[PDB]
Each structure stands twice: as structure tokens, then as C-alpha cells.
Write a protein that binds this ligand. Structure first.
Ligand SMILES: O=C1N=NC(=O)c2cc(OCC3CCCC3)ccc21
Lengths: 197, 196
């Protein structure tokens, strides 16, 4: 497990509240406020999930071997409802639970480049106390292409070799604003931002 | 950390290895099939050596062994499929998003008996009459009865909604099938090519 994590004392899961003024808090706040300056952060929690981390790190090493470069990982946003937060914290992102996107590039889990997109009430639905929830997520975007609404996996790179797949898809390869991933353990929920108007 | 019985792959990460008829391994797998499918004709048995699928599976097995505090979480089951799905399963394993009836939930189905997987609706005969069935290592873990429309196994106690059963079945006392809902809970270990 990463050496900067808090000691969980044999436990496999912990949410750690970050302190404003620490570099770790400030980098996430700045990434958020770059496009969400009209909202205010209540708190930022580091997600320490040993099993999700292990499974994600195995997929990352595999993708780093296959693609024969790094640059497979992006830090993206995912807005969700309060009812989903316990499941995501413990089990991560499940495509079987994903809603249809208003612009669909495939049947998978969606991640935004900009916090403003994830901050829409459609995604980060305000709870009964007006709190909105957004994850900051390590996503294995790898090698990507423009998606299509019918996809249940990324498309093949070559139609004559249908099993050799792109890693993810996007809305626009030249100016990506979202990514869709179709497999478990391709996304690690790293931070949970709780925020309000 | 690849199994001793795998054959050398000359520094590659994926190989389908045809088994030698009459040796220990071929005999063991053939016997599991002929237990219930002795009226079929076996063309060949192939060992699936997929390093990445194996790594991902072994990590989930180690996690399930810790979570359940025992090492009885794995079963050897059967899965019939059509010829056009075989290259995908060999490379990528099983995908619940590529669904036949799903009465016990929206997962991947595995049969206890090869005879069940040998039905033409599962192991669809190709243009040459050939049928395809995997012998699969499945992390069934702690299981409960399934039902239509599950996207994950149910919780073990509704007081902790995120502490789930590992798999579901048709019948907890005498199971004939299992359903798993997560990638890398099943490792396709052998592919049997056969005819009626
Ligand atoms: O071998 C199989 N390959 N693909 C399947 O979908 C499958 C499904 C299966 O049980 C399906 C249930 C039986 C009663 C209602 C639903 C058993 C085996 C296989």
C-alpha cells in the first residue's frame, strides 16, 4: 500500500479527512475550483481501499506493459448521488449501475475532465441537506478513440482483429472532455469531495 | 507467478496449448466432462495460458480468502458458448455486459454439470457442427439464492448493504449453477471442442 496512507491497523478500508493548507488538499481544491469556483468545498476525504487499490494497480501494470508507454492514467471527476457513495467507496465503479448519459458514447462508467461537468445536479445530485458529492478518480484511459452509443466494450483497433481493443473511449480525440470505461478495476476512487452551493 | 503445469511461452503472455491425449492432465479434464457427456465426441482440449487474466483472478482469490477467512472459495464449473465468443473469452475472460435467460441475475452463468452447458442454446454448434465449452475456475465463495434483475449479489445482512455474497445459485442446498457479477471472478482454464 502507498507509504503516505494512514495506518489502518489491519483494516482494509478507511476514509481520511484532509487538512486545508496541505499540498494534497490544495491540489484537489485547485483542480475543482478551476471550473467550479461558484461552489464551496465542505471537505475532501482520501479513500484508502486496499482491495480496490491492489486490483487497480495490477490493471495499471498490465496496461503499462501492453501499451509499452506510461501516460495510461488520467485524474478525472465523477459526480454521483449520496445513495451510491457507500457502494463506490467499498466496491468502486460498476458499469451495470450506470445511467444512460445525455450524450452516450457507450454503456460504461463516465468520467469528466472538468469538475463543472460532474458538478451538474444530473450527476452530483444534491442530498436532503444540499450536499453534492464528486469523486477524483485515477482512470486507465490508455489508448482511446471516439465512442458510439451501442458499445458494451471499447471497439477494436482493427476490424480484422476484433479482440485487440482500445482501452477507453471519449467524446472527441482532439479535445477530450469525457472518458467511458467498460471494465472493473480500471478506475480507482482516490478522493471524495463533499460540496455545496 | 505462473502455475508449474503451464508450458513455457517464450516470453509471451498468452498461449492456447493443445493437451496430449492419454496424459494425466488431459485425462483429468476429459473425465470431468465425460462424467455427464459420455455420448459426445471430443475433438481436442486446450489449456488457456493467459498471464494477465490469471494475475487478476489470483488477486481476487487472495482477497476473497482474506475476506471469508478460509480457502474454500473456488469451484470448477462449465460454460458453453458460441464459436464467435471463444476468441474474446480466451483473451478477456467472461463479461456480464455480453448476455439467453438470466433468471438468477445479470451475471455470467456457470454449470455444475457439463451436460447443462452442452445444450445447443449455450454451446451453439458452428457451421461445421463443432461445440465449445470452457472448464472454469470460479470464485463462488459464500453464495445465496439468486433472482431476476440482480446486478450484484445481495447483501449478507441488509444492516450492512455493501457486505455482499460472492455469488448466487439456483438452489443453496443442491446447486446446479452459479452466477458471478464481477470481472476476474472466473478464469477460463480449458477449452473443450466437441460434437454431438
Ligand atoms: O454454460 C452456460 N453458458 N451460458 C449461459 O448463459 C448459461 C446459463 C445457465 O443457466 C441459466 C439459468 C438456467 C435456468 C434459468 C437461467 C447455465 C449454463 C450456461
Amino acid at each position: 500500500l502507498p507509504e503516505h496512507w494512514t495506518d489502518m491497523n489491519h483494516q482494509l478500508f478507511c476514509m481520511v479527512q484532509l487538512e486545508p493548507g496541505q499540498s494534497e488538499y490544495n491540489t484537489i481544491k485547485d483542480k475543482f475550483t478551476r471550473t467550479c469556483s461558484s461552489y464551496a468545498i465542505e471537505k475532501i476525504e482520501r479513500i484508502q481501499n486496499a482491495f480496490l487499490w491492489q486490483s487497480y494497480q495490477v490493471k495499471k501494470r498490465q496496461m503499462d506493459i501492453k501499451n509499452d508507454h506510461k501516460n495510461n492514467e488520467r485524474l478525472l471527476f465523477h459526480g454521483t448521488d449520496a445513495d451510491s457513495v457507500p457502494y463506490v467507496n467499498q466496491h468502486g465503479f460498476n458499469r451495470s449501475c450506470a445511467g444512460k448519459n445525455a450524450v452516450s458514447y457507450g454503456k460504461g462508467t463516465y468520467f469528466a475532465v472538468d469538475a463543472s461537468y460532474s458538478a451538474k445536479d444530473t450527476y452530483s445530485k444534491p442530498d436532503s441537506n444540499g450536499r453534492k458529492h464528486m469523486y477524483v478518480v485515477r482512470v486507465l484511459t490508455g489508448v482511446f478513440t471516439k465512442g458510439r452509443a451501442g458499445l458494451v466494450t471499447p471497439p477494436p483497433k482493427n476490424p480484422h482483429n476484433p479482440t485487440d481493443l482500445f482501452d477507453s473511449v471519449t467524446n472527441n480525440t482532439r479535445s477530450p472532455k469525457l472518458f467511458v470505461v467498460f471494465f472493473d478495476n480500471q478506475a480507482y476512487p482516490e478522493y471524495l469531495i463533499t460540496f455545496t452551493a
